[PDB]
Amino acid sequence: DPDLNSASQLAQGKVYWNIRFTDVPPAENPNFRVEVTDQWLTEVLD
Amino acid sequence: SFFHGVTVTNVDIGARTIALPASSVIGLCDVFTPGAQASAKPNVPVLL
Fold this sequence. Notes:
The structure is cut from a larger assembly and holds 2 copies of chain A. With 46 residues, chain A is low in regular secondary structure. The first copy, chain A, contains no helices and no strands. The chains hardly touch. Chain B: Belongs to the myoviridae tail sheath protein family. Chain B: This is Probable bacteriophage protein.
């Protein structure tokens, strides 16, 4: 960390490291959105 | 010739670091029964 590793914090033997990360959340609600469309209905012409 | 020789002097003009004294030291005073199993005296402070 740049702002927490000051010249006075390092002089007391304090040096700071930042570890940011993201967990793997459990997919407890997998949503599926089904739609019936007529977009590829003209695909049965050739 | 007030001095003849090398003069190595530490000038000591740095800026000092200031630290926080103590975050949470809890002062406690409640009654107890002094005896055999209790190792404390009924008025002196005991660091716990």
